[PDB]
Amino acid sequence: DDSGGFSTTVSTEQNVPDPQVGITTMRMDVSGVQAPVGAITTIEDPVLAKKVPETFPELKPGESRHTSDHMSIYKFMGRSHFLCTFTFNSNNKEYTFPITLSSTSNPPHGLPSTLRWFFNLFQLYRGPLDLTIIITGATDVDGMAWFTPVGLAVDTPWVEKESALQIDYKTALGAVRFNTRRTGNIQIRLPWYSYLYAVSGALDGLGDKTDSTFGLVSIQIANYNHSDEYLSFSCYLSVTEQSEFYFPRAPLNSNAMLST
Amino acid sequence: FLCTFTFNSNNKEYTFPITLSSTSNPPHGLPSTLRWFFNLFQLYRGPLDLTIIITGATDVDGMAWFTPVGLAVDTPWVEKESALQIDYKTALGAVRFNTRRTGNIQIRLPWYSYLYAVSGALDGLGDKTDSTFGLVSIQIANYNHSDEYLSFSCYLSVTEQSEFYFPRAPLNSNAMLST
Amino acid sequence: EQMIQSVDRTAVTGASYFTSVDQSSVHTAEVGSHQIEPLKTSVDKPGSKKTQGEKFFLIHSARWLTTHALFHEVAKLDVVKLLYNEQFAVQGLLRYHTYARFGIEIQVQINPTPFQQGGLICAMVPGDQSYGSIASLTVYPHGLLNCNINNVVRIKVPFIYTRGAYHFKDPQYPVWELTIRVWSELNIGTGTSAYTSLNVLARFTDLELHGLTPLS
Amino acid sequence: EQMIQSVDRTAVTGASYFTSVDQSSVHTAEVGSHQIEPLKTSVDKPGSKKTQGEKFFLIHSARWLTTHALFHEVAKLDVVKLLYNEQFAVQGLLRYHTYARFGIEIQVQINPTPFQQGGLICAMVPGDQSYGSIASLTVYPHGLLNCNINNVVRIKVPFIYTRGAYHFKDPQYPVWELTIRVWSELNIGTGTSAYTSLNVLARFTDLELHGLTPLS
Amino acid sequence: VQINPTPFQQGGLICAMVPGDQSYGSIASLTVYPHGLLNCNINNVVRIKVPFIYTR
Amino acid sequence: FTTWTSIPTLAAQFPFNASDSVGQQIKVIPVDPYFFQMTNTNPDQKCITALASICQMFCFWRGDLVFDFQVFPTKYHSGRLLFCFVPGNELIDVTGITLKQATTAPCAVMDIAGVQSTLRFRVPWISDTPYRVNRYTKEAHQKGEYTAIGKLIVYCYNRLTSPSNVAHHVRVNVYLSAINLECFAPLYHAMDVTTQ
């Protein structure tokens, strides 16, 4: 033995993910003739809990009618879901919004409907994202959007104010230059910039305000505005293929799944 | 970041150099990241990249051109009328663009000098000659209609054909001035 | 020409964690050796971290009653913080170290008389007892207790944490945490014992120790 | 005829020092493993008894002067008793253990300026400072200090004791003991420093630990 | 460069080969230059080989 | 960018008097590439190190830092020092750790006399996080973000024995060098003098 101990009652580590592929395909009757040993069993024994279940004479259900597997995460969360929305009001206003994976963060200030349920299904999170935003409203506004990692300084989140950060801090880290008239669309990778390894979904104390958040995107505009028309932005987050999930968690209640 | 400038009247010609001297305090010279980085080393040889952004009033047909050392060009860091003819401007090399068509410039800066390389920190007449290598000057037209400011801003970037020489002691925390 | 030998002057001598370079060296005297005994006054193995870290520590014990209604939180216990305690044997390995990596082996012992009925649940919960469901706690590596089949189960769980290692002197958040909800209520007859016993044993697996500190 | 498997009942499960036989067994759950890191947040070796017991502990330090006449007892220090102390790293290995076998590695560090003259002696003395001669102390495994050649020496000495192992909570007698007699007096000139520094380092070699205790 | 200490003195000197300017570069960063470090403990004569560093 | 990193650059300066008790704390070194305390009056310039300019244009830093303590004694200044690195973060009460308590931590001793005078102290990468954020870019303390992987007290391990025709104190330069150095997540920041 490696540790010099022993084990008598059969009970070990439990709930290893991915038991089965969810698209319906054929791997005749499944049960029937033989008496069902998989109906009655011991759930207190996890080896006896992993027995092939049956209760009735069943046969092959057949195949499915869509090759697109709607039960893998990498093609399920490809549809981009809501994050936040915000409007500008005056000249050179700098807006700042984080990406706070905490379930304590009720919407709008935090995770809304689909992001709050999905990113509180699991404990650990590592990988880059995708963000899709839409320019809506007044045209010919030359703004700038940039990412800021953890540790580095940035302006106050969820607050529209004037920018207190210089342009040499903004040009050195990384941003984009675009007008509302040229292309009107942003589909951006969110870089995984942290000295810590992974981020969590539901923590407490100072670990919640530090180890749940990973990144932040803040926007300052210019040439807004001429003759009075509101400019509205809205953030939709999407997924990429370099992220992996860890420790499947009990999903949230029907109460904290708040929709916007 | 390199610099930023605004136009005010009709056919105003703006002129800005690329002065690698550490004596050149920002804005008139190297700002935050360029002043630290291009005073890390003595000798410098190779071409650059410049990314500028058109911001403000639209439908302005201007022109941007490079001028090497030795040849004549207008006064740097001064917005004024152009005293240079168009045959001097069309023969050397420029671009033609409107603010509405593409709104973006990502340009190579050509390494045009009879001297070999340029320096970062010199004194005397060597500082005003052997530190600088190039200059980009801009004259506009159709600016302006109904009054809206047009603002340009210059951001410099790097390419792969440049090489660095003689690693130097970096600058203090005092001359690293940010804009 | 015959040369008389001298003493060495400069050498890298010292421990891997306790290192001091001397400019004047000297040969260390050593007489005798580690003499083996055909007669040992004790009959045990010599002590090591393999037998001191891997030994079950009673970190918690309770007493579940009949009056506890369904899904009542009988015990809310922290795993590693109760392991880091002076009255156990791992304090001699965790006081002189700061950053660690380890795996947690939980064993829970209860005792029903078979005239009682009911059920208990022990779950290994990292992070928080947040808005996740009580009726969804089987996704955790857990244990299910019954008054019909068995009374002792053991649980193996890994290190689940955001950063690289765990800080004892100032932790970010607790790595693991166990809870006891009433999975099925304790029902008895007349004269049957209206209680049952409860024990929580714990030990480390695959222990790593780094960052020695001189202070307490 | 197909037989449904069941759960085990009686088995010898438990540690070698922490052993409990259950009448109702359960399979211990284990998910994940000890995942290796290509990026380690620390660059050290993992901690062990080999790097915690074998590390020099400053057990004593003094300051020898000129006014100390010949064969004056500058320091009377106990070896293992000063090693068994809370402010060192071996307390985490000696608090949870009672009977031990070990070898003693002494290293003594002094520092003369070469305008001073004189000599010091450090001897490893077991048992007693009894009627044995001071001028016969070279029969012990000892060290001789000089203001001419060298300033750091180290001494290896074995376990010298009557019984089998050493009791920390109630010792019969101290195993080892070091003394510092003035081997030659400290003579200086005008303006020369009238002192020298002195350090005593100590560590264990070939450590054995037996007899775990629950108490402090 | 040749200096001469008696070994009852202590201290240190530095000689650096500096092209261009004594500008806003740091004094505490002058080890990036091909230089020499003088000491009252080890040695008293050092020699430095430096190339031609010039723009033209 | 490894040119301005591995070359040892002077980061700090401290003497070693002979009138000090054994075990008295002389100067701690907050172990990071961000550390520097020198300045100059002619010219008026805050003396950066060549390693403090490379890493200040990043968020995170990682690498095995090699401190080089060049003492300047005579051949006859005798005694020893203690360079005890205590890992963790930039802020623990390491001043309350006693000298024999500091013998528990791994460290090294150096005789002031001998045939060499510079000790290259290779700092291990001991941190809870695999990197360490530029918290100097921010302006707030927070448990989880930090600046250093530990601190390094210079102790008085032995007294300074010397005659009167030499000096009573030996000054120690603190060179700053490293090996296997990595930084990422670029930014722009000008570092300020750690005023000890």
What CATH fold (topology level) applies to the domain D1-216? Jelly Rolls (2.60.120)
- A124/C163 Cα distance (integer angstroms): 10
D55: alpha, beta or left? (left if phi > 0; alpha if psi -120 to 50): beta
B1 contacts B152 by C-beta, under 8 angstroms: no
Which method, experimentally, gave rise to this model?
cryo-EM
Find all residues with CB under 8 Å of F74, minimum gap 6, and list them.
E7, E8, E9, E10, E40, E41, F162, F166, F167
- B98/B143 Cα distance (integer angstroms): 11
The verdict on a CB contact (< 8 Å) between B151 and A177 is: no
What does the domain layout of chain D look like in residue ranges?
1-216
- B10/A30 Cα distance (integer angstroms): 86
Neighbours of F73 (CB within 10 A): 26
Q: Do chains C and F touch (3 or more CB pairs under 8 A)?
A: yes
The verdict on a CB contact (< 8 Å) between B173 and F50 is: no
- B160/A198 Cα distance (integer angstroms): 35
Measured in angstroms, the CA of C74 and the nearest CA of chain D are apart by 22
Using only C-alpha atoms, chain E has a radius of gyration, in whole angstroms, of 14
D43 contacts D180 by C-beta, under 8 angstroms: no
The set of chains that have 3 or more CB pairs under 8 A with D is A, C, F
Nearest to F130 among A169, A197, A207 (CB): A197
Neighbours of D184 (CB within 10 A): 16
Under DSSP, the state recorded for A128 is -
The verdict on a CB contact (< 8 Å) between F143 and A172 is: no
Contacts of A206 in chain F (CB under 8 A): 142-144
Q: Phi and psi at residue D101, in whole multiples of 5°?
A: -140, 135
Which amino acid does the sequence have at A19?
A: P
Q: Which residues pair with D58 in a beta bridge?
A: D201
The Cα-based distances of D67 to D70, D180, D192 in angstroms read: 10, 15, 15
The verdict on a CB contact (< 8 Å) between F59 and A207 is: no
The Cα-based distances of A143 to B5, D191, E24, E45, F141 in angstroms read: 17, 76, 36, 62, 32
Contacts of A182 in chain B (CB under 8 A): 102-103
Q: Phi and psi at residue F55, in whole multiples of 5°?
A: -75, -20
The verdict on a CB contact (< 8 Å) between D212 and C52 is: yes
Dihedral angle sign, alpha carbons of residues F56, F60, F66, F71: positive
Q: Where are the beta strands (DSSP E) in chain B?
A: 3-7, 12-18, 41-45, 48-56, 61-67, 80-81, 94-98, 104-109, 118-119, 134-139, 150-158, 163-167
The verdict on a CB contact (< 8 Å) between C130 and A4 is: no
> Tokens standing for B12?
């105003």
> Tokens standing for C85?
């305690």
Half-sphere exposure of B73 (CA within 13 A, CB side): 24
The verdict on a CB contact (< 8 Å) between B103 and A179 is: yes
Half-sphere exposure of C145 (CA within 13 A, CB side): 31
F25 contacts F157 by C-beta, under 8 angstroms: no
The verdict on a CB contact (< 8 Å) between A11 and C153 is: yes
Nearest CA in chain F to B1: F188
Pick from C212, C180, C175: nearest CA to C196: C180
Contacts of C211 in chain F (CB under 8 A): 87-88, 126
Q: F95-123 as b/e, with b when 16 or more CB fall inside 10 Å?
A: eebebbbbbbbbbbbbbbbbeebbbebeb
Q: Where are the beta strands (DSSP E) in D4-90?
A: 29-30, 57-65, 73-78
What does the domain layout of chain A look like in residue ranges?
1-260
Find all residues with CB under 8 Å of C105, minimum gap 6, and list them.
C54, C56, C154, C155, C156, C157, C202, C203, C204, C205, D28
> Tokens standing for F65?
């830092």
Which amino acid does the sequence have at E34?
A: P
Q: What is the dihedral of CA A244, A250, A253, A256, to 10 degrees?
A: -40
Question: Within the 30-49 window of chain B, which residues sit less than 8 Å (CB to CB) from chain E?
Answer: 39, 42-43
Nearest CA in chain B to A174: B1
For chain B, the residues whose C-beta falls within 8 A of a C-beta of chain F are 32-33, 36, 40, 167, 169-176, 178
Nearest CA in chain A to F143: A206
* Class of CATH domain B1-179: mainly beta
C14: alpha, beta or left? (left if phi > 0; alpha if psi -120 to 50): left
Contacts of C163 in chain F (CB under 8 A): 128-129
F81 contacts F112 by C-beta, under 8 angstroms: yes
> Tokens standing for A142?
């030359």
Measured in angstroms, the CA of A141 and the nearest CA of chain C are apart by 41
Which amino acid does the sequence have at A106?
A: N
Nearest CA in chain A to C146: A44
Instruction: Say yes or no: F126 contacts chain D, CB-CB below 8 A.
Output: yes
- Listing DSSP states for A96-145 in one string gives EEEE---TTS-SSSS--HHHHHHTTSEEEEES-EEEEEEEEES---EEEE
> Tokens standing for C189?
């007859």
F1-196: CATH number:
2.60.120.20
> Tokens standing for B54?
């058109």
Place of tokens 């210089």: A166
- E32/B168 Cα distance (integer angstroms): 6
Find all residues with CB under 8 Å of F88, minimum gap 6, and list them.
C98, C169, C211, C213, F126, F149, F150, F151
Q: How many interface pairs between D and F have CB atoms less than 8 angstroms apart? A: 91
Pick from C173, C165, C172: nearest CA to C126: C173
- D146/D118 Cα distance (integer angstroms): 6
Q: SS3 for F51?
A: helix
What CATH fold (topology level) applies to the domain A1-260? Jelly Rolls (2.60.120)
> Tokens standing for A103?
């379930």
A213 contacts A98 by C-beta, under 8 angstroms: yes
Under DSSP, the state recorded for B34 is H
Q: SS3 for F95?
A: coil
The verdict on a CB contact (< 8 Å) between E56 and B130 is: yes
Nearest CA in chain C to A102: C130
C210 contacts D44 by C-beta, under 8 angstroms: yes
Nearest CA in chain B to E27: B169
Sheet holding B48-56, edge to edge: B3-7, B150-158, B48-56, B104-109
- C120/C110 Cα distance (integer angstroms): 10
State the maximum Cα–Cα separation within chain E, in Å, rounded to a whole number: 48
For chain C, the residues whose C-beta falls within 8 A of a C-beta of chain A are 50-51, 54, 126-128, 130-133, 136-144, 146, 149-150, 152-158, 160, 162-164, 172-173, 205
Instruction: Say yes or no: F10 contacts chain B, CB-CB below 8 A.
Output: no
Instruction: Say yes or no: F144 contacts chain D, CB-CB below 8 A.
Output: no
The set of chains that have 3 or more CB pairs under 8 A with B is A, E, F
Q: Do chains B and A touch (3 or more CB pairs under 8 A)?
A: yes
The verdict on a CB contact (< 8 Å) between B121 and E30 is: no
The verdict on a CB contact (< 8 Å) between C150 and A44 is: yes
> Tokens standing for C31?
């007489």
Measured in angstroms, the CA of D78 and the nearest CA of chain F are apart by 16
Dihedral angle sign, alpha carbons of residues D61, D67, D70, D73: negative
Measured in angstroms, the CA of F127 and the nearest CA of chain A are apart by 10
Half-sphere exposure of B163 (CA within 13 A, CB side): 4
Find all residues with CB under 8 Å of A68, minimum gap 6, and list them.
A75
Under DSSP, the state recorded for E31 is G
- D131/D150 Cα distance (integer angstroms): 31
B46 contacts B169 by C-beta, under 8 angstroms: no
Contacts of F188 in chain A (CB under 8 A): 168-169, 172-173
Find all residues with CB under 8 Å of A18, minimum gap 6, and list them.
none
> Tokens standing for D122?
């450090």
Q: Do chains E and A touch (3 or more CB pairs under 8 A)?
A: no
Which amino acid does the sequence have at D36?
A: I
The verdict on a CB contact (< 8 Å) between F125 and D109 is: no
At CA C150, angle to CA C184 and CA C73, rounded to 5? 35
Question: Within the 32-91 window of chain F, which residues sit less than 8 Å (CB to CB) from chain B?
Answer: 44-48, 50, 53, 57
Nearest to F72 among E11, E26, E27 (CB): E11
